[PDB]
Amino acid sequence: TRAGCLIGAEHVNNSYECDIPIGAGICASYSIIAYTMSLGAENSVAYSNNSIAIPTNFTISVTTEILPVSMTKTSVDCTMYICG
């Protein structure tokens, strides 16, 4: 591939979600297979000038987001570190 050459993995013609990003649109997954990652599900929406789609139900979805707020406060004594 344009990212180099891969040995030990069998190239397949399918497209799956990327697991191990090799690069240049090529991913690898577990024998070990190498493919071109698929961007997602391919669907066509039925567009019309007099048609709408309205939901008749709802889903209450709870998602989790993780955000670092702080890290460990480290103090270094330069005289002790360098000289001891």
Binding site: S70, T72, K73, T74, S75, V76, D77, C78, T79, M80, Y81, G84
Partner: peptide, 10 residues
């Protein structure tokens, strides 16, 4: 142990 300390959070 070599002048490296970890300051506890407030």
């Amino acid at each position: 142990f070599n002048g490296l300390t970890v300051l506890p959070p407030l």
